[PDB]
Amino acid sequence: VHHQKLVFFAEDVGSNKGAIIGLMVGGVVIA
Amino acid sequence: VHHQKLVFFAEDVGSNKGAIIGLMVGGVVIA
Amino acid sequence: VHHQKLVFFAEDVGSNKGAIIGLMVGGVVIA
Amino acid sequence: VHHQKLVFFAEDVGSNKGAIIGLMVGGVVIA
Amino acid sequence: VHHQKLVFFAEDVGSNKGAIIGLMVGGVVIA
Amino acid sequence: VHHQKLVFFAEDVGSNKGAIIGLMVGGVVIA
């Protein structure tokens, strides 16, 4: 298979106080 | 298969205090 | 198969205090 | 006059992604 | 006058991704 | 006048990714 640009932003992000995950597959994120 | 640009923003994001996930497949996100 | 731009915003997002998921397939998101 | 415990929680708060205000008297909150 | 414990939590707060304000009297909060 | 303990937590705060303000009277907070 092929994955690409799963998340994409074309313009500026101010902040990320949380989670940004291209491809969450297991385990535990807490943001 | 082929995946691409699953999430896309063309303009600026101010903030993300939560979760942004291209392709959640298992495990646990808490944002 | 082919997926693309599953979620798309063409203009600016102010905030995301919740979940934005291109393709949720299993597991647990809590935003 | 006397004010006290205007807002009160006795048990655990999970999250506050919004506004919690004891006493709003003017100005502008955006949560 | 007298103010006290305007906001009160007795048990644990998990997170505050927003605003918690004892006494908003003017100006601008954006959380 | 007299102010006291305007915001109060009795138990542990996990995180503050936003604003916690005893007494907002003017100006601009962005959290």
Side-chain angles (χ1 to χ4, degrees):
Chain A
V1 296
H2 183 41
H3 300 107
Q4 184 176 354
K5 287 208 179 66
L6 293 187
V7 176
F8 172 36
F9 308 71
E11 272 287 312
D12 43 357
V13 164
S15 58
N16 173 51
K17 314 203 186 179
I20 310 182
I21 307 169
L23 171 52
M24 172 63 138
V25 180
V28 173
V29 172
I30 301 178
Chain B
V1 296
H2 183 42
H3 300 107
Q4 184 176 354
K5 287 208 179 66
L6 293 187
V7 176
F8 172 36
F9 308 71
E11 272 287 312
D12 43 357
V13 164
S15 58
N16 173 51
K17 314 203 186 179
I20 310 182
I21 307 169
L23 171 52
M24 172 63 138
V25 180
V28 173
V29 172
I30 301 178
Chain C
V1 296
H2 183 42
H3 300 107
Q4 184 176 354
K5 287 208 179 66
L6 293 187
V7 176
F8 172 36
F9 308 71
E11 272 287 312
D12 43 357
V13 164
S15 58
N16 173 51
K17 314 203 186 179
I20 310 182
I21 307 169
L23 171 52
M24 172 63 138
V25 180
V28 173
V29 172
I30 301 178
Chain D
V1 310
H2 182 42
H3 300 107
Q4 186 170 358
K5 287 183 168 74
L6 293 186
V7 175
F8 186 106
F9 307 72
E11 239 283 294
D12 45 72
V13 165
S15 58
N16 173 51
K17 314 203 184 172
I20 310 181
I21 304 167
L23 172 51
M24 245 291 214
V25 182
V28 172
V29 171
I30 301 177
Chain E
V1 310
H2 182 42
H3 300 107
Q4 186 170 358
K5 287 183 168 74
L6 293 186
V7 175
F8 186 106
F9 307 72
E11 239 283 294
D12 45 72
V13 166
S15 58
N16 173 51
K17 314 203 184 172
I20 310 181
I21 304 167
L23 172 51
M24 245 291 214
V25 182
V28 173
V29 171
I30 301 177
Chain F
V1 310
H2 182 42
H3 300 107
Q4 186 170 358
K5 287 183 168 74
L6 293 186
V7 175
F8 186 106
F9 307 72
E11 239 283 294
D12 45 72
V13 166
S15 58
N16 173 51
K17 314 203 184 172
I20 310 181
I21 304 167
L23 172 51
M24 245 291 214
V25 182
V28 173
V29 171
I30 301 177

